[PDB]
Every structure is written in C-alpha cells, then in structure tokens.
Design a protein around this ligand. Structure first.
Ligand code: ADP
Ligand code: MG
Length: 374
C-alpha cells in the first residue's frame, strides 16, 4: 500500500489491508502527514473524498493509552454520523485490543453512557455536542486529558447556533495545548472566524474534486414497464445480452435482498449488498464480485469495473445519483451499457432531467432482427 510512505504502526497497516484500502486518496496524502505529526489541521474537501480515515488513522497513530483517561474527542453533528465514526475507529483498532472506544448521543438514556464511563472508561470518545456537554457537566466525563479534539463536518455542526454554542463550551473544558483538527465539505458560509477560535495558526488545506465523472462512451437505454413486469424483463434480458458481470440497482434493502434471492433460485450467480449490511460484510461480498466468483451484483448503493452492463432496476433518486451509479470511470478505460427501468411519471421525470443535465439521449431498449453487441 501507499500508506507505508506514512509509516504507521504495523498493527495499523494491517487493519488497512483488511479494510480493502490499496492506495491513499488525495486528501489522505494531503492531510495525513501533518495530522500524524500533531499539527492543527483544517482539511476541507468535497464529500466522499476520504476525510474520516485521516483523523482516525492519525489519532490511532499518536494515541498513547492511559487507563482511566480519555485522550481523543471526536464530534459529529448527527448521531448517525458518530455511530459510523465509532465503527471506523473499531475497524482500524482491530489489531490494537488495548485501545477502547465508545459513542454517546442523545436519544438514549444518559445513565447508560455514565455506566460505560465508570465500568470501562474508553480512550477515544465519539458523539454529539449536546450529550458530550451533559456528561462533561455531570462530571462523568473528564475532558482535562484530551490531546486530540476533532470536529467532523464542522460546517454543518457549526452552522447550527445551539450546537455551535455547545462545541465552544466543550472546547473550553479541554486543555489548551492539544491537537485540534476540523474537516468540512465546504469552506463554509463564513465559519473561518469560529475556526480561528479553536486553532492556533492551523494549516488550511484544500483538495479539489478528484475525477469528474462523465457520461461519455456509454450506451444508455430505457425500458417502459409495470413493477409487476420488471422481473420477467430483467431475467429475459439476462438470457439475451452478453456480459461478464452486471450490477443492478434497487431502491430498498428489502427489494435488494429479494431479487438476488430470486436470481439464485433461477440459477444466476447473484450476490447482494445493501445499505443495512455492516462494512466488513460489504467488502466480503464485494470481494466475491471483484474476484469474479459471482457474476451479478444487486446493490442498493454504489473501482476497476469488470461490469459491462449497469441496471437501474428502479429509477435512481435524481440526476446525480444516476451519474454516480452508471458512469464507468474508476480505473481501466473502456465503454459500457446502461439500461434503466421506469414505471411511473416520477421515474420519467428523473430520466428526463438526465437527458437535460447531461445533453445526452436515452431511447427505448431495441433489438430488431439483430441484437446489440458491437
Ligand atoms: N484510501 C482509500 N481507499 C479505498 N477506500 C477508501 C479510502 N479511504 C476511504 N475509503 C472509503 O471510501 C469512503 C469515503 O471515506 P469517508 O472518510 O467517509 O469520506 P468523507 O468523510 O471525506 O466524505 C468510506 O466508505 C471509506 O471506507
Ligand atoms: Mg466526513
């Protein structure tokens, strides 16, 4: 891996291979060396660019565990986010059993958080601004030993007056000499001042959007149908079209699991991957699809792309999702096939925006006296 040029603890580099990371992203090359040396950093980059990994590895790397002491403080604006970063820490500390983690957010009893803090104080704390605040004031949470204060999606978090006020108070109960890092999708609607408050001459860093996905060199067609007609059409298209591997996109986690099932009952080498499945599992099944073990993939979400045909079993939420689902442009340079299903005017509207945004055309799927293989 290219993470070696980062010289991380071996126990850490191991977790990096199990997570399927082969190479670091631009923001990882851009923000990781400074994060590890203990500098205050302001790493800004468009979503999905690879930011969380940066503070997770960097802290796991500097972290020097002390029983009964919390050394890392991570905050998120939504509990859905904290929960995931908590899992992120878990996945990278896999070979560091001595390192402990815990998340605290509202929606749960504050008495359970205190139970964790008393029975098995963690070294890393993740959570929302208000609950943390409560624990710190309860006195259950002692923040006088924090050495790493990280704010994720600071824009969003700080663009909320009440929460912004909690982040500042928390910040004040923490030591003065410490590493502070912020990560944001935007440069924010004038959030730099609040930022010049937490960081002593921090390093501003900006990584431009990497790889503008394009709909060029892609054959795109639609197939008008009823929802009760889709399965037969899908299956008939799997007997006619030629491929090596295919991805299919379904809305709900349920539809996703019921389709791959049905595909298996008809002897199609299909495996599924939905939004509910935990990461460690998504990579297990993604491996059987990259390994070419299986031929069809039924995803709810979504490198090399040995896939020749991409399906939108049911229309994608909007123009962008379509572009981020279909557009073949990960690594190897080639073409592709995109067939989309439509069952109402809602789907129609979405496909029409696709034709307008990207000035492209999408005709009905054909097959006259020929086929379509070129
Ligand atoms: N170097 C890498 N190689 C492959 N996948 C990566 C790498 N870094 C991160 N990822 C994965 O890609 C996704 C994006 O990272 P994330 O930190 O959530 O992005 P951001 O917070 O910048 O939106 C995650 O699902 C993560 O597991
Ligand atoms: Mg992030």
């Amino acid at each position: 891996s290219g993470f070696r040029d980062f010289l991380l603890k071996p126990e850490l580099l191991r977790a990096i291979v199990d997570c399927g990371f082969e190479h670091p992203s631009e923001v990882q090359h851009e923000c990781i060396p400074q994060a590890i040396l203990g500098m205050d950093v302001l790493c800004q980059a468009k979503s999905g660019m690879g930011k969380t990994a940066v503070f997770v590895l960097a802290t796991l790397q500097q972290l020097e565990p002390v029983t009964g002491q919390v050394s890392v403080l991570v905050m998120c604006h939504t509990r859905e986010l904290a929960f995931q970063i908590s899992k992120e820490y878990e996945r990278f500390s896999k070979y560091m059993p001595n390192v402990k983690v815990a998340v605290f957010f509202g929606g749960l009893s504050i008495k359970k958080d205190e139970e964790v803090l008393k029975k098995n104080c963690p070294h890393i704390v993740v959570g929302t601004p208000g609950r943390i605040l409560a624990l710190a004031r309860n006195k259950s949470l002692n923040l006088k030993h924090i050495k790493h204060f990280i704010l994720d999606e600071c824009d969003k978090m700080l663009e909320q007056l009440d929460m912004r006020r909690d982040v500042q108070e928390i910040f004040r109960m923490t030591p003065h000499e410490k590493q502070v890092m912020m990560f944001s999708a935007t440069l924010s609607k004038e959030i730099r001042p609040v930022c010049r408050k937490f960081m002593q001459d921090p390093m501003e860093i900006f990584v431009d959007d990497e790889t503008k996905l394009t709909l060029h060199g892609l054959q795109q067609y639609y197939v008008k149908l009823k929802d009760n007609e889709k399965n037969r059409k899908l299956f008939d298209l799997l007997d006619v079209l030629e491929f090596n591997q295919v991805v299919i996109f379904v809305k709900s986690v349920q539809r996703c699991i019921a389709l791959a099932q049905l595909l298996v009952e008809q002897n199609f080498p299909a495996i599924a991957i939905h939004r509910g499945m935990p990461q460690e599992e998504r990579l297990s099944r993604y491996q059987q699809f990259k390994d070419f073990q299986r031929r069809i993939l039924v995803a709810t979400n979504l490198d090399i792309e040995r896939v020749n045909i991409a399906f939108n079993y049911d229309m994608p939420e909007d123009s962008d999702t379509y572009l981020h689902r279909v557009a073949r442009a990960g690594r190897f340079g080639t073409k592709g096939l995109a067939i989309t299903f439509v069952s109402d005017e809602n789907d129609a509207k979405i496909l029409n925006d696709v034709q307008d945004r990207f000035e492209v055309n999408i005709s009905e799927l054909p097959d006259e006296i020929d086929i379509s293989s070129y």
